[PDB]
Amino acid sequence: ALDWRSALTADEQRSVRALVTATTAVDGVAPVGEQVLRELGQQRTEHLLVAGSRPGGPIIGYLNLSPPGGAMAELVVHPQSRRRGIGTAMARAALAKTAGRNQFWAHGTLDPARATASALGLVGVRELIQMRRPLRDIPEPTIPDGVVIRTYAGTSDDAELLRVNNAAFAGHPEQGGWTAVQLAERRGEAWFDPDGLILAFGDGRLLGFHWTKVHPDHPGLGEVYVLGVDPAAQRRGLGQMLTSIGIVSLARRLVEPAVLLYVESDNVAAVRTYQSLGFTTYSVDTAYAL
Ligand SMILES: CC(=O)SCCNC(=O)CCNC(=O)[C@H](O)C(C)(C)COP(=O)(O)OP(=O)(O)OC[C@H]1O[C@@H](n2cnc3c(N)ncnc32)[C@H](O)[C@@H]1OP(=O)(O)O
Numbered sequence: 001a002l003d004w005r006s007a008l009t010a011d012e013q014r015s016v017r018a019l020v021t022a023t024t025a026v027d028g029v030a031p032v033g034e035q036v037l038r039e040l041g042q043q044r045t046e047h048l049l050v051a052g053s054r055p056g057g058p059i060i061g062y063l064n065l066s067p068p069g070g071a072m073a074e075l076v077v078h079p080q081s082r083r084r085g086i087g088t089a090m091a092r093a094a095l096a097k098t099a100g101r102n103q104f105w106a107h108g109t110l111d112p113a114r115a116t117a118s119a120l121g122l123v124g125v126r127e128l129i130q131m132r133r134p135l136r137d138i139p140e141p142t143i144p145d146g147v148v149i150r151t152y153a154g155t156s157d158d159a160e161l162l163r164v165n166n167a168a169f170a171g172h173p174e175q176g177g178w179t180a181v182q183l184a185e186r187r188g189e190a191w192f193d194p195d196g197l198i199l200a201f202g203d204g205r206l207l208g209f210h211w212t213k214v215h216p217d218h219p220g221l222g223e224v225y226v227l228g229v230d231p232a233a234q235r236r237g238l239g240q241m242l243t244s245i246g247i248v249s250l251a252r253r254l255v256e257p258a259v260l261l262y263v264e265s266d267n268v269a270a271v272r273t274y275q276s277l278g279f280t281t282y283s284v285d286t287a288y289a290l
């Protein structure tokens, strides 16, 4: 019997982290994301834990259902316990619970997940591509005149940063409609670096920005965190220029060392921008749904 849980004890949290770490070791990819791990100690989501056979043992399966669109499920069956129906039972429980509306996130779109998706009658409905490029032979930015580049100067720049982010991402489910609240939350994170947030102004109104990120726990890697160009300043070479400047900045500050990014497979403009700068597909995350 699969019992939906709204909260977990400390031991259960430890049990789930153990299952996740054991799985990452074997699969080479973490089966659930970092936010799912942060939800383990909260009462904001719903969970399924499948216990092993005898008392005092580790768990063999886990699923998290995060409320939203439909909810999002992330799940994992221990490598030693696969092909026994556990993944299907948890997935079907999620589908029954959400009336067929939830999606499932397959990090890395590995063979087992693809096969399980096929067996469950699911199809890929979104592909988030992680692309990378090395820190060598990097591009050289071309700053057109009438444009000046500088880093974020603090709250003085928040009005323009929010305006441009919200104009570029208008209609975007989660990157659009930001307020000073979202900025504060990020600046409070240890990875924030104001000199890693690159701004281009007319020479002036903010034209676009490139927020880069180096996480203290992932040495050797830099990330494109948010890239946005005001629609009034798009299709003039600024997005490529900003990405290029960020690569130069990251390479100075920093598998193989690299700059990585995440881009929706159908974001034609961003995929083109990144492809022009030598990024190539590293892995793909697929959201599966009925
Ligand atoms: C839609 C999704 O599953 S999104 C899943 C995202 N999670 C992950 O990718 C995390 C890493 N992977 C895992 O934890 C597991 O491999 C899961 C969750 C994908 C599947 O868990 P399992 O308990 O092994 O699934 P289950 O036993 O229910 O398999 C159902 C069917 O899928 C197919 N299947 C599952 N894994 C494989 C595989 N490696 N190769 C071929 N077919 C497979 C088979 O048809 C299987 O039936 P069968 O075993 O009778 O032949």
Ligand SMILES: CC(C)(COP(=O)(O)OP(=O)(O)OC[C@H]1O[C@@H](n2cnc3c(N)ncnc32)[C@H](O)[C@@H]1OP(=O)(O)O)[C@@H](O)C(=O)NCCC(=O)NCCS
Binding pocket: 168, 169, 225, 226, 227, 228, 229, 230, 233, 234, 235, 236, 237, 238, 239, 240, 241, 267, 268, 269, 270, 272, 273, 274, 276
């Ligand atoms: C992605 C984005 C930053 C590109 O900015 P930009 O200033 O228009 O970029 P550039 O002028 O340098 O153009 C870069 C490439 O995108 C293409 N492109 C730009 N707008 C396009 C559009 N509307 N349709 C199709 N292709 C487009 C350019 O032709 C160019 O192609 P090329 O690299 O093959 O030469 C901008 O379109 C934007 O902000 N998009 C919305 C926010 C977003 O999704 N950002 C990524 C998530 S962090």
